[PDB]
Amino acid sequence: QLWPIRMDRLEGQRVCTAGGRYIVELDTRCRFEVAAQGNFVKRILIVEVDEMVQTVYVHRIPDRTVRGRNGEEELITLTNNPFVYTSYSQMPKEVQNDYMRLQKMVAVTISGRVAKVTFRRPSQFPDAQAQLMENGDLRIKLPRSVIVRKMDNGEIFNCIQKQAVSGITLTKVNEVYKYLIRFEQCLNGMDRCFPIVFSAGTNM
Amino acid sequence: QLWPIRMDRLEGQRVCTAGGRYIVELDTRCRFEVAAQGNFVKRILIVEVDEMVQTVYVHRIPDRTVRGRNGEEELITLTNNPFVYTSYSQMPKEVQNDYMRLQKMVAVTISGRVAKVTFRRPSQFPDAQAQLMENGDLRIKLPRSVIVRKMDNGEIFNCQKQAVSGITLTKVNEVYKYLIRFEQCLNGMDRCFPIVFSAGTNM
Ligand SMILES: [Mg+2]
Ligand SMILES: [Mg+2]
Numbered sequence: 011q012l013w014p015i016r017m018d019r020l021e022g023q024r025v026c027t028a029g030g031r032y033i034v035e036l037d038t039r040c041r042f043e044v045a046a047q048g049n050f051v052k053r054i055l056i057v058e059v060d061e062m063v064q065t066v067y068v069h070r071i072p073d074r075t076v077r078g079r080n081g082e083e084e085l086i087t088l089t090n091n092p093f094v095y096t097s098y099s100q101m102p103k104e105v106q107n108d109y110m111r112l113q114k115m116v117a118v119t120i121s122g123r124v125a126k127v128t129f130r131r132p133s134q135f136p137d138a139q140a141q142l143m144e145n146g147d148l149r150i151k152l153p154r155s156v157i158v159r160k161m162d163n164g165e166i167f168n169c170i171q172k173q174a175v176s177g178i179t180l181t182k183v184n185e186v187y188k189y190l191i192r193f194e195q196c197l198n199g200m201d202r203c204f205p206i207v208f209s210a211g212t213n214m
Numbered sequence: 215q216l217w218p219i220r221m222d223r224l225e226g227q228r229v230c231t232a233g234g235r236y237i238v239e240l241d242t243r244c245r246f247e248v249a250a251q252g253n254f255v256k257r258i259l260i261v262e263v264d265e266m267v268q269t270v271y272v273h274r275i276p277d278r279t280v281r282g283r284n285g286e287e288e289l290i291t292l293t294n295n296p297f298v299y300t301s302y303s304q305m306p307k308e309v310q311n312d313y314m315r316l317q318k319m320v321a322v323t324i325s326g327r328v329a330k331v332t333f334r335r336p337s338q339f340p341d342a343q344a345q346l347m348e349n350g351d352l353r354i355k356l357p358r359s360v361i362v363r364k365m366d367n368g369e370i371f372n373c374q375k376q377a378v379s380g381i382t383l384t385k386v387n388e389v390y391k392y393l394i395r396f397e398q399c400l401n402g403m404d405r406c407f408p409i410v411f412s413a414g415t416n417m
């Protein structure tokens with residue numbers, strides 16, 4: 011789902027690219043300080059979620075007023091007259107593009123770095139730990155190598171971009187992936203936890 | 215539920231009392247070598263479960279031929295003509311009594327010693343580990359003391375015996391709820407235990 015943006019367990023998280031700065035301020039608020047041509051900030055997107063309703067604040071900054079900032083630097087001061095959007099289609103396409111860049115950075119890149127469930131010594135690999143990331147990706151930490159299963163396209167490759175391999179181990183990744191997805195979706199039936207580290211089976 | 219007897223994760227568990235020897239041979243088979251007057255074995259119950267069907271074999275051993283054996287000793291050889299029961303009501307009351315003694319020993323005493331879910335550093339006690347036992351009992355291992363919540367009567371006590379409460383009694387029930395909801399939630403697992411875990415934000 012593209013709306014609202016999911017920021018659960020993603021607080022404190024930042025990313026800096028050539029396109030600007032992406033900051034998840036709270037589990038209910040993230041930010042996109044868009045860097046423009048000439049490295050000045052002309053637009054700041056604020057995305058805030060109250061339970062199930064989401065508000066997107068689009069601040070417009072006059073040119074040559076504020077420069078694109080690096081990661082741990084202070085948040086740029088916001089304007090007092092931002093455009094306000096309460097639903098996706100209300101946003102114009104030119105603003106919608108900047109919104110896509112932010113939610114992608116949060117749901118794909120950032121969520122891919124954050125471990126949600128980690129399983130130590132599965133019966134599938136009693137010699138390592140299997141990590142299911144926030145974006146659904148599976149990461150199996152081996153000595154000096156990582157077996158990666160991408161949630162988006164189902165691809166499988168071993169790493170040090172990297173690649174690749176397959177054969178016998180590729181069959182092995184799917185049950186632990188299924189186990190953990192089964193563990194997560196089942197643990198998604200938890201009452202209104204994550205992140206979790208566990209061991210199961212033997213011995214033990 | 216008294217039938218069938220639940221023996222999951224209880225293989226290997228044995229108990230020796232004055233009433234006889236109680237042995238869980240497999241997760242689908244348990245055993246009660248009943249001690250008789252004169253410390254001889256006159257009756258052996260075998261309880262076996264195939265998925266959901268349970269068969270109870272009641273062996274009758276002639277008096278004064280075989281003595282009650284101690285723990286980890288060889289299983290007494292069975293007879294070739296045991297009474298066979300496929301349901302609870304089929305059993306006569308004297309066999310039913312011996313059956314109750316076995317299922318109690320397995321579901322209460324033995325199950326109370328086996329940890330099923332253990333949670334390290336819950337937010338309610340980030341300094342200990344909480345264990346949910348097979349019989350539903352909660353055991354919280356503290357430094358030099360154990361907080362016990364009995365599943366049957368809801369009683370709460372520390373550690374001889376001895377009992378406490380007041381402040382701290384409030385702390386035990388949510389973790390119990392947390393773990394029971396964790397257990398019952400993990401009961402929706404596909405066709406795991408036992409499990410040790412840490413959760414949240416101390417890690
Ligand atoms: Mg370990
Ligand atoms: Mg620890």
Ligand SMILES: [Mg+2]
Nearest residue numbers: 334335342343
């Ligand atoms: Mg501990």
